[PDB]
């Protein structure tokens, strides 16, 4: 008694784990039911998909799936409703991890359904098509004996795996066999489905309780069934169309597969028939099935769970405990520092370039992290992704091994120094960018042009608030050249950077103004960072090369525009067309602020149409100034027509047949002081009056109209907020106090039209428009 | 490539892990330096000491210590400054666990020190003495080759384990060998001390840097050296004197050891010679050493860590990642539910006694737990420790295996059912007690006697605030009888319960008033729960028996009283002597609230001496009513002489010779309105004025003295908080407005003495005092 | 129960096999005495030397020595005259192979003798020479803790490995520890000579029976 077995860990691929010929996986009776919300599931599938995608590159890369701790129950003392007559030969009651295992078996069930049914749609007279049909049969059977097992006689001839105590008893006989737990029932039913002769229709699923089985929640069944069916949807979509939304699950493509020898060997122990790398090089109807199968094989033979087997249950619980207490992992920077300590040059580093860069990055990390441990990792991810765009042009993930591996890769391309310490200079500079223009945007750079300073400054303060980090790459790329330049070209730099900032915010405003979402834009900037620019001179996001150089000032503008063509559209007519019909408040509130502030650039109330606005005062009160973003003068996005009229305070239901009406430009302005807290709002009249309050050009109308509105009750909440003698000029609220008639739906349409047009005119000079 | 090594897991006793003959433990260069604060170290030692204590019971209980994940560096690619000539043959660079491992090596160093020097004090002419001296030699050597290792020639002929990269190079040659990290240096130097002939003094230690080695923080050395010497002090105290503070580290005593066969086999492969168990039964100069030796051998051979070995570093990182994702363990209650499902009777439970109890306990858990996952286990602990009092009379520990084991033990004593399902009825009642008089005390039970209701109600609200849960056993024990009673003896029960509550508040008030701490009280309440009371009639804390019956109503009082003798002291004289000299504001503030509210029970300002108080108005305004605990009339503890007078607001330093003065009753009362937030305090005059303010028996003293004090300034902070026209009667504050002279230390003694006298008078009737 | 241990095999260098820090090798009481005529010994050395010579060429060339089958006697039921007080912590009763094992232990004893006494002939002042002396110390010790093991106190503080039942009781105490079987006594006596300070004379060897130990044959000795 010292190691007297105690515990017993070994690694297994999920195929060698699940499909062991005589085993039953058994959920002990104190486990909760299936929890795992769909984000945990998506992380799961995306993990294995990532490891697969990275397998083409690194031929030995193994993907991990955690631990399962189980009791090897040898006298079947834990199968609480059992028929010893024929319990399986090795039961492994799952002490911990049963959530993963449930997810896993389900994953196989959907991989099985998809690969089967797409494979019957195959033309078996095409040589590569039959190759694919055969490969499919292979993986189909190999998953089939992964989730269920052919015990050899009786009705209920097939045993699931996973089972739960109480509901579900393993047996192969005609009475006495139940499969009634969520996973128990699910696997029983799918299994019988697969064995349908003359099947080949996709899987329905007939969810349980024909009149019984209230041993669980019925909500549990709902959850498990839904979770499975969404695994099926995720995968279906991961090979299908091209809408390719930002997360989804990216596994390599037909061309990817066909041209990766190592992927072929490590998943099919053989090199592909050349007829097939041909058929795959260009989708050709069979590439989705083949991609699903490659994913299948990677799942089976290259994803591994760590299996810990205890022989006594009490040891097993103490094991679980000892494994829930296992340290505090290290950010990819910490684990990467050794690899530059060991190139600079030896261990004599302290006053040797890289030390300074690392002093920078570590300083920033200790500052903004510190507070916790995964705060420290999310800060590290924050400074690492812009860098990945910057130094390379690749989308870095938030997963540790990737960050570690990418830093290792990039650092080990140009194997010098002066060459490598430029790579580290990259990270240093992204940190430095976070310290200047993003902390408080007013630093920006120096430069004169003092309208440029606060214009690019509003660009920054808006790009911070509301997502659009994708940009931190490029802009750091340029903030770099301003601080790396011959003492003369300080001004040249400062200008390129400032203009770049403006144009990025502009393109932001247009892309998210027109579409309803950040659809491609992340990918578009990625493509920008890699695309060839001007024959052989630079490459957009510094790429080896030399950090100081590259690209110009303005190849941004021409490329972003040339893109605004394509599936972007850039004629003010086409663009304001898209943007007048997109609910901007639903999207990012800082975008709608940018749009209102750009639409009311030195603007004035319109006399021809009561409530619109127009331009023409070159510099009346110019709003695209960073000082007028923060301007808590007018800094509340107020809806004219409210979002909530639950019993209808009155209003016009023309505005609510389409629930997006209430959230377009034409329904909002920037109102000072109160939001919905001090003194605010009501129905279209009290709203008229409130706007009439703040728009008067004399105090002998200010107090007059304060009193005008106090009759119906403008002093709402107590006695009207900071509402006694406010000056201030708000062109949109002035020309909104000037409309009587009523608040029509047509009028919000025309208003959002007019507002978008003004903004477009105000901004598109920021991309330097002529395309 | 499928399990292609990847990883490789094995359990080893810390002896077989550390003292393997060719191994080097190597801390790679991205590890933090030695972190672990003393709470963690003390937890560690307690874990192993617990394992020992529980090995005495269960001869098989193995104690776990978690995981260390290490890279078997096979070509020494991570020994970052190296002399390959004699790198040790097997280095294991530690990815995770270097904190535990560092602690462990330090621990061996301290046990080696203690056992060394304590065995030199042995009279080696005595047969059990020579056994102990040898046994000491045995573990002494097995620890020695546990922390260092004998490479065989040269200066620096001895290698550490644990070494840190960058600083520290293993080698045996005369230049060229460094051990300069915190752990490296510690191990090197301690080893030299151990190998000193003609030594035998305890280890001093000469911390590092004779003028160098500033690659580190100089604080790291401080922290590590300190943690070592306090491991040493911790043990020294756990086997030495008798002060036995609340934590300490509980390891068995000579007798414990001497009479437990299984402990002797499992640590010494053999039964002790009886001469030794005899000399052990009563310390006799050799028992501390033996206790320490038993502890060290348990450390060496029965603490076992799981060692996970990877062959590539990045595999090790991904593993570490995969073992940080390891479920969320379950409360001892969840893992015990099955074992009562399978006694009721079989699986046809749903309408079966035990189901009801569990539904109750589960409801209460899901209600108050829920919010987190370890909050759920902390809720379960809150209901489990008192249940341990109630159904048995044992101190349950807050550790999981202990809770599970106790539940299995108790549930399976009287192995019928009805005996068992009564045991479960126990848990249900603890939860319901937590739902009745502890949530809001105001429910209490029913009954008339309506003074008992708010009197036991203040008893409860007082026992809840300010620790003293030790009672929850008893009272639940009683609350049961009120809900389980022949409908006639409902009133008898309700009364018993209320009186139990009062008596406990009394014994509390006295015990923490007179003594300085919860010194014995815990043992006292447990003692009552186990003692035989009246031969064969019952037993105080339900012990099987039958839930409704048992004990009386008032044997509580007699027993608690008989105990108030001994080391309790209860002659009003003795008690006031003790309690006048205990700073009660220092201990539990609710205790001082209880003592002041009992000291002003229908009390009146004293005229004979200006500022004390006297009783006698039987029902003037009686304060021991739960409606007056919360009565934020008088619910602020005001110090007369302030704790803060750093430059002397003026005041009297007679009160500051002894810092316990400022915090005795004689310096505190119950003040309405302000503490130190609205309008408050100053120097003793303004304090006079504030006490004169709220004591006014007319409004024409209210406004008069309000403005009196605004002259010096009672409106401090704004304009005197809720201070205009207050009725309100606070007898204590009147006789505080009634002392002129000055605020002396002598008078504070007098004041606390009288207040204590009064409270003693007011409360001891709650124990129905005759002893 | 299908492979439920049944058996359990693994390879070990003669170093990691013999010198396990807590092990005792025990010849059960039905084994024949030491037989092996000098030719089997000659093949033993010639094989190990051949593997050695073939290592210069192939850096992976590993040399085998056969199999030993042992029972991991866990509650000391085959140690036939025992002091449980301090039987070694892990005994392995050798079901097959005790002839190799006896040869081996003897071999380690002779290599230890030669390397020791030749190294004391070293002029420890010549740089390669001190290289050699140290190397001697390293191998010398790693053979010492190969044939015996330092249990830590008492007279007869050192245990042989290999011991034969009936004759020979492992213990570290002053009565009660016997080593009178042929190997037992040889290893014990070699061990004592190893630890003689100020020896450094080659080994003589003073064989048994000052008047006793005819529990065996005397020819085996």
Author numbering:
A (entry chain A), B (entry chain D): 1 to 771
C (entry chain C): 1 to 221
Sentences from the paper on this structure:
In the PT-based defense system Ssp, SspABCD confers a single-stranded PT modification of host DNA in the 5′-CPSCA-3′ motif and SspE impedes phage propagation. Notably, SspABCD coupled with SspE confers resistance to a wide array of phages through unusual mechanisms: (1) SspE is a dual-function protein that exerts both N-terminal NTPase and C-terminal DNA nicking nuclease activities to defend against phage infection, and (2) NTPase activity, including GTPase, CTPase, and UTPase activity, is stimulated exclusively by 5′-CPSCA-3′-containing DNA in vitro. Here, structural and biochemical analyses reveal that SspE is preferentially recruited to PT sites mediated by the joint action of its N-terminal domain (NTD) hydrophobic cavity and C-terminal domain (CTD) DNA binding region. PT recognition enlarges the GTP-binding pocket, thereby increasing GTP hydrolysis activity, which subsequently triggers a conformational switch of SspE from a closed to an open state.
The full-length SspE structure revealed a smaller NTD (residues 1 to 324) and a larger CTD (residues 332 to 771), which were connected by a short linker of only seven residues T325TGQPLT331. The NTD of SspE exhibited a DUF262-fold with the strongly conserved D96GQQR100 signature motif, which was essential for GTP hydrolysis and was positioned at the junction of the α3 helix and the β4 strand. The CTD of SspE contains a DUF1524 domain that belongs to the His-Asn-His (HNH, the last histidine of which can be replaced by an asparagine, as observed in SspE) nuclease superfamily and indeed exerts DNA nickase activity in vitro. In contrast to the typical HNH motif in Cas9, GVE2, ScoMcrA16, ColE7, or BrxU18 that consists of two antiparallel β-sheets and an α-helix, the HNH motif in the CTD of SspE from S. yokosukanensis DSM 40224 was composed of two antiparallel β-sheets and a loop, suggesting comparatively higher flexibility. However, the active sites of the HNH motif in SspE still adopt a characteristic ββα-metal topology, in which the first histidine typically acts as the general base in the DNA cleavage reaction, asparagine is involved in structural stabilization and the third residue, which can be either histidine or asparagine, is responsible for metal binding. Indeed, single-point substitution of N676 in the HNH motif by an alanine or the elimination of divalent metal cations, i.e., Mg2+, markedly impaired the DNA nicking activity of SspE in vitro. One unique hydrophobic patch that was also lined with positively charged residues, e.g., R32, was located on the surface of the N-terminal region of the SspE structure. SspE displayed an extended dumbbell-like shape, with a short loop linking its two globular NTD and CTD domains. The NTD and CTD packed loosely against each other, with few contacts between them.
